[PDB]
Design a protein around this nucleic acid. Structure first.
Ligand SMILES: [Mg+2]
Ligand SMILES: [Zn+2]
Lengths: 82, 25, 129, 82, 221, 102, 71, 134
RNA sequence: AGAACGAAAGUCGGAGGUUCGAAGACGAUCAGAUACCGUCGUAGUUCCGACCAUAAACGAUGCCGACUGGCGAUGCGGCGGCGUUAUUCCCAUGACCCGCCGGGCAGCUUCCGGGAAACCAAAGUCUUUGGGUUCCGGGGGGAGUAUGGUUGCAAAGCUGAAAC
RNA sequence: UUACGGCGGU
């Protein structure tokens, strides 16, 4: 974690969500890491690249994952912008 | 013995040592 | 009957960030809570915030982020010296690395690390981490 | 509902709320124009009036107060001004 | 979509409105206030059909993102949506668990139906909440084509269409099945898809075998 | 252990309801504690109806109802069996039992 | 709960010097009447003559004749 | 006392599923089938399994008992796999709608496109059944 | 510090005394019934004027302030609405229907959280501890007793130990 | 309707 000599001293850096930006633990088994597969501009077919979004399990169990992934795809290449 | 019939027997008792201590003027 | 409008301002932040929300609403302003929030803005725990200026003490909408844990207050505004500031750290900070208490000096509302560089003591105002 | 942009609302959702508790406070009142039928001056009575208001020439009833919003007795040349 | 390739395509909206799917009426969940338009004069709520179109293309993007085709655990409990699931999974090559979901299936690793997917898709949230609860433990996203009633705890790409009508449920499986194979190379995207959506509608009682073969004494007998 | 959320008595914003007296044992209970029952039983004991119509001078005579409100203490509600011992997670329901007229 | 504040230390001190009179092993060290009460009287040992040998009985689970004197 | 045990009711479902075609609705023939096809240890449960197997043989030829044998198993492919109709109930060429649901497909940019005549839901608000006990 | 109102029972004075009914009498029941049951019944209930200041006076939760989920309602106003309905043959008002706003007793649910757990949307914002401020608890007994103070017509209340 | 009791330590 960037010590005095600046070398990486940690076990591992775990994930963090993008709905409430909390730190998903090693046992938070309600936390999805989901894939959204976009298509190219011309043929509507799976060109080969996608997107990844993590949702922490506490914000899942609360009730607004669908409110979340609408909004965290809203800015990010989606259908709407409306 | 109940709590209120612990009172009544020790209310009947304290109205006696208020009277026997008053006996010896 | 609102004794300490700072403490309500920070309690409104503390409950609404653990829900994970992006925005809050602080109802009465003061010139001691706008200078409070620009301390944790220049250290980047929160971000943009508006002063919704009405003619009385206006509202404040803070765009929260999600870098924050607890932003409490010290409700007695104690005095703290510079031989005293080291005991306030290891009572209520999570570490010696990060977090800040914030004490209002005679020279302006500053951190604890900014104050010991300027080498003035003042009254403690709150803490955030 | 984690990220409702509560600084820019639709003003007919902001119309639903109290006269306090709004993003900026505003009364639910107005001044309104009243012409008695067969007279020659507009009267500009407040909407939530409280007294038995008399007119200038035609000394008769002009508006009658109630719980909230004072009732105009006769159907008059009436509109919500400014 | 963002393109014209993935747009609303007005002619198929004539299958939405020939299946209902703008029907709610009773009342609404507070986290499906976003997919509403208004209450009718009847007390009934109607649904902005571009919102259920924008999520359905978003939900079909989720299935194509799964590499293994025999992996999206497609489940249902209520009867309308049991014929639909079983040849959804025959169409796009998925894994169907129809009827009564056996509790302790996704993750109790001893018995025979120990199936561990990487995505899930539901007919109804509150009528089938037992897999919703269990998919929260193998950290596995679910997609529930939810009505204005049904709650939204363990769901992720919840489609706001309908879950109670007979023709309503079967079209939404059809419209999703047409799309998930259109993001694959199957449907040629200009020519229509040949599987007529009457195939996905819930079965009547056994008055079937009278009326269909009483219109077949000139082609068989 | 607080057994019941409302404490048997369905009052909220009061200090004192009118104490009414039980119907068979004449015991004093408050008005909203009492196990209420309202009986609209026919007076004729409807086995005994086509034994009086031969004796009736009228042909379509509407037999009168009988209107009694029984209000109980909880002690003589159980022993005379209008209420019954129940279970934990089936106490929190305020519904009456089914009717079933025949 | 607690009144608090920077200037209220008179209330917080005249609340402690009388809520200290309610725990016992302070109270039998400062109240005085429990200092006279013990026969040793703030001491550790005492001499005394023996007046009577007695045998008391043991408590509820045991049964024995414990021997004592009457100093 | 007639009620039949588990291991007889267990061993009948393993037979009659797997040998649905090698049977009949006769007790005395299916008695001889059951000894031929699986080792029964003694005579009493031989013809007591056979009785319950025949109890299903007059039965699973009528209705949907757990009868996943091939004659049932391919039969519902006349139902779910077959039966594509010639008229689509998605296509009536006329659908009747509401004045607000054409507001919904006016901002969906579709008001001038298809036929779509309306039937307005009437004056009312007589939903929400009269609440409480009577 | 200080005052006010305080159920019942109670005490004092005067009216009144139907009913119920401490005490009491008597009959039953019982080994024994000074208890349950039965009958008669005094003080009391009932009003008036003076006193007493206690109750499981219980939401067993001091008051004030904020923030933090949802839904269906019920009560009071206020605003706006398809309509049916009232004299209404039209108006303006009442009734019902759909909402929204504020305040009130509340309710159903939930993994916001909390808790020893029952459970509580406050008993939550608490080892990530600090929004005011009041009273009060420190193992159980001895004890709400002893003494003193004061109050009271009396009963008793308030203040309240220690030996052991 | 009546229906009370059960020596001390394991
Ligand atoms: Mg008692
Ligand atoms: Zn009774």
């Amino acid at each position: 974690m960037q010590n005095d000599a600046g070398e990486f001293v940690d076990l591992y850096v775990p994930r963090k969500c993008s709905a409430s930006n909390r730190i998903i633990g090693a046992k938070d088994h309600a936390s999805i890491q989901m894939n959204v597969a976009e298509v190219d501009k011309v043929t509507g077919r799976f060109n080969g690249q996608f997107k990844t979004y993590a949702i922490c399990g506490a914000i899942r169990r609360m009730g607004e994952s669908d409110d979340s992934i609408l909004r965290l795809a809203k800015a990010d290449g989606i259908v709407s912008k409306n | 013995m109940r709590a209120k019939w612990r009172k009544k027997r020790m209310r009947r008792l304290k109205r006696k040592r208020r009277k026997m201590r008053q006996r010896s003027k | 009957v609102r004794m300490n409008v700072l403490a309500d301002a920070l309690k409104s932040i503390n409950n609404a960030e653990k829900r994970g929300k992006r925005q809050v609403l602080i109802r009465p302003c003061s010139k001691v809570i706008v200078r409070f929030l620009t301390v944790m803005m220049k250290h980047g725990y929160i971000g943009e915030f508006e002063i919704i200026d009405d003619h009385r003490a206006g509202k404040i909408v803070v765009n929260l982020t999600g870098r924050l844990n607890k932003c409490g207050v010290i409700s007695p505004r104690f005095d703290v010296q510079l031989k005293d500031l080291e005991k306030w750290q290891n009572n209520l900070l999570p570490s010696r690395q990060f977090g800040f208490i914030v004490l209002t000096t005679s020279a302006g509302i500053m951190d604890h690390e900014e104050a010991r560089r300027k080498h003035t003591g003042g009254k403690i105002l709150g803490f955030f981490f | 509902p984690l990220a409702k942009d509560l600084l820019h609302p639709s003003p007919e959702e902001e119309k639903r709320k109290h006269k306090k508790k709004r993003l900026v406070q505003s009364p639910n009142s107005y001044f309104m124009d009243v012409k008695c039928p067969g007279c020659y001056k507009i009267t500009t009575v407040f909407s939530h009036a409280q007294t038995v208001v008399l007119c200038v020439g035609c000394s008769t009833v002009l508006c009658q107060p109630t719980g909230g919003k004072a009732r105009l007795t006769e159907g008059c040349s009436f509109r919500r001004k400014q | 979509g963002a393109l014209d390739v993935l747009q609303m395509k007005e002619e198929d909206v004539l299958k939405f409105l020939a299946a209902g799917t703008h029907l709610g009426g009773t009342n609404l969940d507070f986290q499906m206030e976003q997919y509403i338009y208004k209450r009718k004069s009847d007390g009934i709520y109607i649904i902005n059909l571009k919102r259920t179109w924008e999520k359905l293309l978003l939900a079909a993007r989720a299935i194509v993102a799964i590499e293994n085709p025999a992996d999206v655990s497609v489940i249902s409990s209520r009867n309308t949506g049991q014929r639909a699931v079983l040849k959804f999974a025959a169409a796009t090559g998925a894994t169907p668990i129809a009827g009564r979901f056996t509790p302790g299936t996704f993750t109790n690793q001893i018995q025979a139906a120990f199936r561990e997917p990487r995505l899930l898709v539901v007919t109804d949230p509150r009528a089938d909440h037992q897999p919703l609860t269990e998919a929260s433990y193998v950290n596995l996203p679910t997609i529930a084509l939810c009505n204005t009633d049904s709650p939204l705890r363990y769901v992720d790409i919840a489609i706001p269409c309908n879950n109670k009508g007979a023709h309503s449920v079967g079209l939404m499986w059809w419209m999703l099945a047409r799309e998930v194979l259109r993001m694959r190379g199957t449907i040629s995207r200009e020519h229509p898809w040949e599987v007529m959506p009457d195939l996905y509608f819930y079965r009547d009682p056994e008055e079937i075998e009278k009326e269909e073969q009483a219109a077949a004494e000139k082609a068989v007998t | 252990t607080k057994k019941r959320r409302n404490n048997g008595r369905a009052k909220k914003g009061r200090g004192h309801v009118q104490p009414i007296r039980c119907t068979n044992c004449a015991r004093c209970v408050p008005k909203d504690k009492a196990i209420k029952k309202f009986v609209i039983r026919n007076i004729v004991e409807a086995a005994a109806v086509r034994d009086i119509s031969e004796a009736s001078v009228f042909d379509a005579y509407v037999l009168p109802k009988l209107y009694v409100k029984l209000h109980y203490c909880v002690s003589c509600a159980i022993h005379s069996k209008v209420v019954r011992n129940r279970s934990r997670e089936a106490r929190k329901d305020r519904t009456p039992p089914p009717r079933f007229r025949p | 709960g607690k009144c608090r504040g920077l200037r209220t230390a008179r209330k917080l001190r005249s609340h402690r010097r009388d809520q200290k009179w309610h725990d016992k092993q302070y109270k039998k060290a400062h109240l005085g009447t429990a200092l006279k009460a013990n026969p040793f009287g703030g001491a550790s040992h005492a001499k005394g003559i023996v007046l009577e040998k007695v045998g008391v009985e043991a408590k509820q689970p045991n049964s024995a004749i414990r021997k004592c004197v009457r100093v | 006392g007639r009620v039949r045990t588990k291991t007889v009711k267990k061993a009948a479902r393993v037979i009659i599923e797997k040998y649905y075609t090698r049977l009949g609705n006769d007790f005395h023939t299916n008695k001889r089938v059951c000894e031929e096809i699986a080792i029964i240890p003694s005579k009493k449960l031989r013809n007591k399994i056979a009785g319950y197997v025949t109890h299903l043989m007059k039965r699973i030829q009528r209705g949907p008992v757990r009868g996943i044998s091939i004659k049932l198993q391919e039969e519902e492919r006349e139902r779910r796999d077959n039966y594509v109709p010639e008229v689509s109930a998605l296509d009536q060429e006329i659908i009747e709608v509401d004045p607000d649901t054409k507001e919904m497909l006016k901002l969906l940019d579709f008001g001038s496109l298809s036929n779509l005549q309306v039937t307005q839901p009437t004056v009312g608000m007589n939903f929400k059944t009269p609440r409480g006990p009577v």
